[PDB]
Amino acid sequence: SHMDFSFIKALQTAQQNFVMTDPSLPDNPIVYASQGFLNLTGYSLDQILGRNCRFLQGPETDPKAVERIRKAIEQGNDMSVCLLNYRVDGTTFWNQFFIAALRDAGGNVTNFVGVQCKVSDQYAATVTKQQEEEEE
């Protein structure tokens, strides 16, 4: 019914790409980020907290996927999207990332959790083909 602190501790440490964001604060900013997340994105820790993950997007990013994400966030749905993200140095990578809407015993969204997965160009091609085939 709550959050065991083991979750929060192993999150900041896990060599994979995890993030947690707080909807209670404005703009839903990152409160905890994994070490593998900083390895993948290349950012320092001070450039992560207090900000929303929009800084991973850029020019060549599919805005339909971004609208999908923001709709699922406004409704608090658990989703997953593959899109092109940018590191700090400007390099690009295909991020297939998940979003979970953790809710308390009252049904209210307490925190958002995000798992990012770097996928190859073949997986990106197939999943983008499906997502673009999802036309209305």
Contacts of 3 (CB under 8 A, 6+ apart): 102, 110, 111
Nearest C-alpha neighbor of 83 from the set 52, 54, 124: 124
Q: Tell me: does residue 39 bind its own copies (CB under 8 A).
A: no
82 labelled ligand-binding:
no
Q: Tell me: does residue 6 bind Cl ion (CB under 5 A).
A: no
Rounded Cα distance between 45 and 99, Å, is: 21
Tell me the CA distances in angstroms from 5 to 11, 12, 100, one per residue in order: 10, 11, 18
Q: Tell me: does residue 96 bind its own copies (CB under 8 A).
A: yes
Place of tokens 């809710």: 103
Q: Tell me: does residue 95 bind ligand FMN (CB under 6 A).
A: yes
14-73 residues in contact with ligand FMN (CB under 6 A) are: 19, 21, 28, 52-54, 56-57, 66, 69-70, 73
Q: Tell me: does residue 120 bind Cl ion (CB under 5 A).
A: yes
For the CB of residue 46, give the shortest distance to ligand FMN in the complex, in Å. Answer: 18
Binding mask 45-84 toward Cl ion (x if CB under 5 A, else -) reads ----------------------------------------
Whether 35 and 12 have beta carbons less than 8 Å apart is answered as yes
Tell me the CA distances in angstroms from 132 to 20, 126, 127, one per residue in order: 28, 10, 9
Binding residues for FMN: 52-54, 57, 70, 85, 95, 116
Binding residues: 52-54, 57, 70, 85, 95, 116
